[PDB]
Short mmCIF file of C-alpha atoms in Angstrom, two decimals:
data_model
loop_
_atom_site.label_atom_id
_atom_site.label_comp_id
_atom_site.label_asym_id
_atom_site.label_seq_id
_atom_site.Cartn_x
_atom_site.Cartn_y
_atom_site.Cartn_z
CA UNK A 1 115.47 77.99 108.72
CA UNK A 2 112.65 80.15 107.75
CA UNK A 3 110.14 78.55 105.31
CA UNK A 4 107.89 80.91 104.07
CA UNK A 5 109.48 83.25 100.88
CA UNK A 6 109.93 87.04 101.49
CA UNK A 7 107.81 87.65 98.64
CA UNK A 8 104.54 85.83 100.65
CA UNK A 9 105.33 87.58 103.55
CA UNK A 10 105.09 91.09 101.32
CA UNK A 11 101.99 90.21 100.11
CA UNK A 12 100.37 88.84 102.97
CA UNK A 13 101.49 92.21 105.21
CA UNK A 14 100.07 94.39 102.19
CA UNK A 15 96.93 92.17 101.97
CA UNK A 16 96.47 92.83 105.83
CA UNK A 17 96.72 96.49 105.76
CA UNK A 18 94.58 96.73 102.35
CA UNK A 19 91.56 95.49 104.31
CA UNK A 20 92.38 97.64 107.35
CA UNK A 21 92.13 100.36 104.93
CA UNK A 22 89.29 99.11 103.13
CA UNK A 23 87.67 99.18 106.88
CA UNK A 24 89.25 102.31 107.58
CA UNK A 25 87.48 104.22 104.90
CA UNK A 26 84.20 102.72 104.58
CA UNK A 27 83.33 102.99 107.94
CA UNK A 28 84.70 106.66 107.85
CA UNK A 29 82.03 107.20 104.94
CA UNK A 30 79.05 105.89 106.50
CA UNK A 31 79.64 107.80 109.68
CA UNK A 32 80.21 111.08 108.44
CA UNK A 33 77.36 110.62 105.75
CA UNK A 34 75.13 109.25 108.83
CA UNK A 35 76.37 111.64 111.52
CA UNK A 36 78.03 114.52 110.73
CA UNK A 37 75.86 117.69 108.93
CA UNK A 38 77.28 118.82 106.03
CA UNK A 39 78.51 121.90 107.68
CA UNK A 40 81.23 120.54 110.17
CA UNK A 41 82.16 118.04 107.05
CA UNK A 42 84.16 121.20 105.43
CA UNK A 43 84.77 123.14 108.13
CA UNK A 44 86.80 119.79 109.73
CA UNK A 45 88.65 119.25 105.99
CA UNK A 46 90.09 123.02 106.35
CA UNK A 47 91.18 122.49 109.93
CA UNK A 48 91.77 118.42 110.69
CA UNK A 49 92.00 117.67 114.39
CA UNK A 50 95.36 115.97 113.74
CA UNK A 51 95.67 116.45 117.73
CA UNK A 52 93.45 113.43 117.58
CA UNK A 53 96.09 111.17 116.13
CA UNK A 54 97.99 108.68 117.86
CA UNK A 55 100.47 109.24 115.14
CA UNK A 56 101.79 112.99 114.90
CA UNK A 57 104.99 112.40 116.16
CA UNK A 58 105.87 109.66 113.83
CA UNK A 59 108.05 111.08 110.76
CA UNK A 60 106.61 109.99 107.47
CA UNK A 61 107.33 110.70 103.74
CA UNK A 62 105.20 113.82 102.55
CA UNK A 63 104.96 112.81 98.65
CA UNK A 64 105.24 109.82 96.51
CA UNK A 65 109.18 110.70 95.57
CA UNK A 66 109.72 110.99 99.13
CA UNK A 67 108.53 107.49 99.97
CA UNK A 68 110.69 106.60 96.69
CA UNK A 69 113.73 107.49 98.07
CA UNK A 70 113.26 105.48 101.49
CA UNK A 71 114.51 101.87 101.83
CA UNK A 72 112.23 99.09 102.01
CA UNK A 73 113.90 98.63 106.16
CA UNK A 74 113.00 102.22 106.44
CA UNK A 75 109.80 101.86 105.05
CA UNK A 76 108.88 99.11 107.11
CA UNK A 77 110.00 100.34 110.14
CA UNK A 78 108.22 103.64 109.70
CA UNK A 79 104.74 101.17 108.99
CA UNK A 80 105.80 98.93 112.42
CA UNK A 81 105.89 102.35 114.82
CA UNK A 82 102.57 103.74 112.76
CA UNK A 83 100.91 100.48 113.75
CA UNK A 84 102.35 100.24 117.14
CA UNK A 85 100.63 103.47 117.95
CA UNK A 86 97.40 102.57 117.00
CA UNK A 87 97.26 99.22 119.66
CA UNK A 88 95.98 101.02 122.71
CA UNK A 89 94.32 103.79 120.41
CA UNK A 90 91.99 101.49 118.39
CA UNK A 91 89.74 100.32 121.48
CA UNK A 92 88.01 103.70 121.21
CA UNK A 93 86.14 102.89 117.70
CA UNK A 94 84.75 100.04 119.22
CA UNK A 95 81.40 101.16 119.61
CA UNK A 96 81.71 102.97 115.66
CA UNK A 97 82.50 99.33 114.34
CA UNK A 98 80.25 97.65 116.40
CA UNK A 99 77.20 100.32 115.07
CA UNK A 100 78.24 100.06 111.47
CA UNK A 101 76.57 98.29 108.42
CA UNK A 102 79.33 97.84 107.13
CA UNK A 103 80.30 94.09 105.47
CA UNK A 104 82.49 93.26 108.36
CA UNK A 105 82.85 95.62 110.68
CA UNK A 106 80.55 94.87 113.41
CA UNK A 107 82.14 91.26 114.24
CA UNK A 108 85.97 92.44 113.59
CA UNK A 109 88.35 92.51 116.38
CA UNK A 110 90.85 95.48 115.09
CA UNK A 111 92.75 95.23 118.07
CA UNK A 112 93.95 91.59 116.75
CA UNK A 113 94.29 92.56 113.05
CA UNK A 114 96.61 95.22 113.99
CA UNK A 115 98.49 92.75 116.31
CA UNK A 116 98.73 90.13 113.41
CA UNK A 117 100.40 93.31 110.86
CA UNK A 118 102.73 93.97 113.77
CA UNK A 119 104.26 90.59 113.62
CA UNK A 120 104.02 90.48 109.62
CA UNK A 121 106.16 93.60 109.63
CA UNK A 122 108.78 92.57 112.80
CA UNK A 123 109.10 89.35 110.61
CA UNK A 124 109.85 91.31 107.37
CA UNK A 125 112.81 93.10 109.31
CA UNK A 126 114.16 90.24 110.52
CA UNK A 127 114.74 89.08 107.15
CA UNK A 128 115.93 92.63 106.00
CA UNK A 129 118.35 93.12 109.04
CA UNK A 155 81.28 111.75 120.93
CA UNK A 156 80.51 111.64 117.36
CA UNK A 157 83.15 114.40 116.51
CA UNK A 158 85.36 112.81 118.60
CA UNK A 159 84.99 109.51 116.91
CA UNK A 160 84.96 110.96 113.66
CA UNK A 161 88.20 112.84 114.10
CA UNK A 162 89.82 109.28 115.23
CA UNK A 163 88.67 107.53 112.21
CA UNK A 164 90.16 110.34 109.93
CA UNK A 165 93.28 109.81 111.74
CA UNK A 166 92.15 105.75 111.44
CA UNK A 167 91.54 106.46 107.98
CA UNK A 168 94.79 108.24 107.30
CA UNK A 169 97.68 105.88 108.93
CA UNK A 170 96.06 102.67 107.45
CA UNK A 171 96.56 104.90 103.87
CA UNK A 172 100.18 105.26 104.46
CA UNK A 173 100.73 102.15 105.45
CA UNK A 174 99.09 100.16 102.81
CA UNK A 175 101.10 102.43 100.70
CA UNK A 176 104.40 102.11 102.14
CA UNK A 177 104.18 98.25 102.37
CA UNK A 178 102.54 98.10 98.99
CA UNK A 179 105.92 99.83 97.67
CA UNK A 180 108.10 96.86 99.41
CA UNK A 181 106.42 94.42 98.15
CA UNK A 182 106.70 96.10 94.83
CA UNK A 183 110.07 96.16 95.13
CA UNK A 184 110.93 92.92 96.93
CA UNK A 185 110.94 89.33 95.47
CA UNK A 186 108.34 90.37 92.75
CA UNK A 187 110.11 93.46 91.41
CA UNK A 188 107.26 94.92 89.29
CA UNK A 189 104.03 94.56 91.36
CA UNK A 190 102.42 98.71 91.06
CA UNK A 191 98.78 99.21 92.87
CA UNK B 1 59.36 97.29 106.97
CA UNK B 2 62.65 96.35 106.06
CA UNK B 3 65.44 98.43 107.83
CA UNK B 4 68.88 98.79 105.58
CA UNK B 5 68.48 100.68 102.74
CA UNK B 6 69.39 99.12 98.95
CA UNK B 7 72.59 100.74 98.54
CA UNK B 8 74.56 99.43 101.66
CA UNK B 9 72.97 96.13 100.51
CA UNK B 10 74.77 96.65 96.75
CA UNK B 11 77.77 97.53 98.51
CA UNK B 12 77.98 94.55 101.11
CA UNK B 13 76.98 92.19 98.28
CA UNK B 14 80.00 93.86 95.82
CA UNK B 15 82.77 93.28 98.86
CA UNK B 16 81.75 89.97 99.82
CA UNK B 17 82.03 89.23 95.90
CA UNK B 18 85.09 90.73 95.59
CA UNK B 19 86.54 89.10 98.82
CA UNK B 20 85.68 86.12 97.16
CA UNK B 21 87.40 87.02 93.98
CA UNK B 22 90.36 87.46 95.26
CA UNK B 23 90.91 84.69 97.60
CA UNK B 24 89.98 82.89 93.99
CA UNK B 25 92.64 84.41 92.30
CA UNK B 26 95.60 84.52 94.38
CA UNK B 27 94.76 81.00 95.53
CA UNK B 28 94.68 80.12 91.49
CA UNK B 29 97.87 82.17 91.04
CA UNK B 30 100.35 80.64 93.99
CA UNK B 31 98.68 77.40 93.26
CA UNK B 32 99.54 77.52 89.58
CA UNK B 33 103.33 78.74 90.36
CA UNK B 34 103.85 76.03 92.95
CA UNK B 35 102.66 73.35 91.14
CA UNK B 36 101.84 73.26 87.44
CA UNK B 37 105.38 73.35 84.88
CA UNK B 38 104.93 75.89 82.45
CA UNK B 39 104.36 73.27 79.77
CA UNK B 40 101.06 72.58 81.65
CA UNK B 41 100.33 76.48 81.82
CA UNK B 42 100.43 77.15 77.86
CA UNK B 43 98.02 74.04 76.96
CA UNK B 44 95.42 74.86 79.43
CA UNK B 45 95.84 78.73 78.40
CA UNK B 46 94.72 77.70 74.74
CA UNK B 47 92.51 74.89 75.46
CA UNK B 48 90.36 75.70 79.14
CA UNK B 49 88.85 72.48 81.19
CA UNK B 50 85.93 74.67 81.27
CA UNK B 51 83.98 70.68 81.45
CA UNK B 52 85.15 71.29 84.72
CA UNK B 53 82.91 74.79 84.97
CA UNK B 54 79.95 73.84 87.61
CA UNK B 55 78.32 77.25 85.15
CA UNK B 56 79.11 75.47 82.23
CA UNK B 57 75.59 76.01 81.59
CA UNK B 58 74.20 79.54 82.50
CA UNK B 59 74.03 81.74 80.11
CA UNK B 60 75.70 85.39 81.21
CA UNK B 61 77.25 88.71 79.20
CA UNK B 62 79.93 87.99 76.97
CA UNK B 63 81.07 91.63 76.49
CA UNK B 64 80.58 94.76 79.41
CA UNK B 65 78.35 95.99 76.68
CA UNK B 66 75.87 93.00 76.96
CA UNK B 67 77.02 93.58 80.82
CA UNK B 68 75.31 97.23 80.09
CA UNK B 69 71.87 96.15 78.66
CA UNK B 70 71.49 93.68 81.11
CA UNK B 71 68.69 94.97 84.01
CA UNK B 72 69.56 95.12 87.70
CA UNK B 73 66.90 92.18 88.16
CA UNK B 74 68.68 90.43 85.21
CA UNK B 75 71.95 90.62 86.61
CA UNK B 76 70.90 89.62 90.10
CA UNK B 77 69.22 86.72 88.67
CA UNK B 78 72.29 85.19 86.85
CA UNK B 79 74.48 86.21 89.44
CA UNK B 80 72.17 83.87 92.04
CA UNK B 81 72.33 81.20 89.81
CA UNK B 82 76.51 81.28 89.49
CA UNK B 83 76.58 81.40 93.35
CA UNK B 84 74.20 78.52 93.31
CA UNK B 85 76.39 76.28 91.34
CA UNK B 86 78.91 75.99 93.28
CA UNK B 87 77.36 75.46 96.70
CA UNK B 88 77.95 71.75 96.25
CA UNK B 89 81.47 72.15 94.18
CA UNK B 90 82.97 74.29 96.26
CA UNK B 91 84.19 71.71 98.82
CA UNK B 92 86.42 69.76 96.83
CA UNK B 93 88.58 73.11 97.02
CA UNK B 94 88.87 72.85 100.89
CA UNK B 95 92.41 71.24 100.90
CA UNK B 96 93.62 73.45 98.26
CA UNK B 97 92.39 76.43 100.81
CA UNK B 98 93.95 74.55 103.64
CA UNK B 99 97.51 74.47 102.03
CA UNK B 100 97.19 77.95 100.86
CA UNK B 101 99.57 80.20 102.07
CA UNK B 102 97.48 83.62 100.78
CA UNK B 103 96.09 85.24 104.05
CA UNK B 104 92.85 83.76 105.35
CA UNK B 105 92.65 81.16 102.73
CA UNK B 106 93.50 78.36 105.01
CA UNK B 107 91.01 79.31 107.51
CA UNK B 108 88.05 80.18 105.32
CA UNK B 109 85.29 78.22 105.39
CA UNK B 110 84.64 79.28 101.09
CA UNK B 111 81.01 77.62 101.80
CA UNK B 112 79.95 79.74 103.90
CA UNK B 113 81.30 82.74 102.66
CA UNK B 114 78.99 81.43 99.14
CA UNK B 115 75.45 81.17 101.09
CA UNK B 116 76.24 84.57 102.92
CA UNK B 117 76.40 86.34 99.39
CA UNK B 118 73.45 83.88 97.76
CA UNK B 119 71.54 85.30 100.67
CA UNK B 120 72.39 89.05 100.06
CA UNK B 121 71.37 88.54 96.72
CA UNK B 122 68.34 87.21 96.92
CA UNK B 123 67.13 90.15 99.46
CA UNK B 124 68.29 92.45 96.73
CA UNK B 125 66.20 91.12 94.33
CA UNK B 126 62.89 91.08 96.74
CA UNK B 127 63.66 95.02 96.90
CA UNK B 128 63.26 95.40 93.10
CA UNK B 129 60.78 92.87 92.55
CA UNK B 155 94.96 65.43 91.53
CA UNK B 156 96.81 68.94 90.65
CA UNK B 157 95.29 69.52 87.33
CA UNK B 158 92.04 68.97 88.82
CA UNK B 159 91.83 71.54 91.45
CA UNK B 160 93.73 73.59 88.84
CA UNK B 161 90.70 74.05 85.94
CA UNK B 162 88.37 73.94 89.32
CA UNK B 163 90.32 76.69 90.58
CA UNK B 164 90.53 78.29 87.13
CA UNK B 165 86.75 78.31 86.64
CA UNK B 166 86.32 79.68 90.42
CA UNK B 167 88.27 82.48 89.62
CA UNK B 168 86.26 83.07 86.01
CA UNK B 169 82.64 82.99 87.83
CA UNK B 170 83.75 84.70 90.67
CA UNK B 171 85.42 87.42 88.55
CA UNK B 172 82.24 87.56 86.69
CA UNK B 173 79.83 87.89 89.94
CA UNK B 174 81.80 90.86 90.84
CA UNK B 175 81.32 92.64 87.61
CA UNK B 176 77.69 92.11 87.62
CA UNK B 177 77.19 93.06 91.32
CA UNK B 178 79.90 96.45 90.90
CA UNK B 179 77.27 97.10 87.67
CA UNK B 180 73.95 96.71 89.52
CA UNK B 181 75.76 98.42 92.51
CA UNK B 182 76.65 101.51 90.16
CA UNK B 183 73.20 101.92 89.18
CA UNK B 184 71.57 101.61 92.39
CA UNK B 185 71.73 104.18 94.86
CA UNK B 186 74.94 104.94 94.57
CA UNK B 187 74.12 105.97 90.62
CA UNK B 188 77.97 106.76 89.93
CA UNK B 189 79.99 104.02 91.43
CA UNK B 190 82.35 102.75 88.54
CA UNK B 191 85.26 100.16 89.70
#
């Protein structure tokens, strides 16, 4: 029998992808503020290079009352296919992690922390059952560890602690 | 000359303090519902082991107003000094830590991760110059690391990033 409580395992999968996004974002910052001129910053926010992303073909929830109305199985297994594309993906930033300043970044193995949120969220269902190249990736890096901090931070909101928010 | 500029080294020394903060508190939080009956909880609430408190004795801001006041050097200084006190107290937490199951608690080495942000403050400041035992332990942990983090998010708010907030 299974020893560690549902509600752990919630936390623990949100604490996971929290720091991936913490990761995500900061390293997306100091790149673009390093790197990229000010003119291909706005010109890339009016036209993203979503072609870029691993992730396109995966179906998400568009708005916060979308993601509302999905279960927490749905949820989770819309987080476990999000993740699963980024396993062959994330090798490319590499060299951007390894370069960065960043508390962390340089001697992280992202490969591994995705493989460890993987198995937190196939273990929650079984309960429940160059440089604009790189920057485009981390947007898209950036972007998919948002969602998915968000959708498991809204099952573990509404698993064993019923009133947990952000 | 030295080669990272002060803000990244405001912002590594915030997440490492925050890092810390939280593997204080939700190591003080499972700890607490695991083990100590609510009877316990209540007393302690109203009457804090703060004897206990390595810090017992450094003076810091009572309000965020005397937080305010306070000069980056200032700040910096008593932050040092609350890293500094628990260098040595720190590693009668290790089997709390190693029964934790918050992720990475149980395979942090907390000393370490204590003389990695001692170190990144005193760089800063060159630029600008059984159970109810590890409980209150664990309880003042959490209060000084809380407190470090405020102090570091204030001095990192004013430094070059001169609009930070929390």
């Amino acid at each position: 029998f299974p020893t560690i409580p549902l509600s752990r395992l919630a936390d623990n999968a949100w604490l996971r992808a929290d720091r991936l996004n913490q990761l995500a974002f900061d390293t997306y910052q100091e790149f673009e503020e390093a790197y990229i001129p000010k003119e291909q910053i706005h010109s890339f926010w009016w036209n993203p290079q979503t072609s870029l992303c691993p992730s396109e073909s995966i179906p998400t929830p568009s708005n916060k009352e979308e993601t509302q109305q999905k279960s927490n199985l749905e949820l989770l297994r819309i987080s476990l296919l999000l993740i699963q594309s980024w396993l062959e993906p994330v090798q490319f930033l590499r060299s951007v992690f390894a370069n960065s300043l960043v508390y962390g970044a340089s001697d992280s193995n992202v490969y591994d922390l995705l493989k460890d949120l993987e198995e937190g969220i196939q273990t929650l269902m079984g309960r429940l059952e160059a440089l604009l190249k790189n920057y485009g990736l981390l947007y898209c890096f950036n972007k998919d560890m948002s969602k998915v901090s968000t959708y498991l931070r809204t099952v573990q909101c509404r698993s064993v602690e019923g009133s947990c928010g952000f």
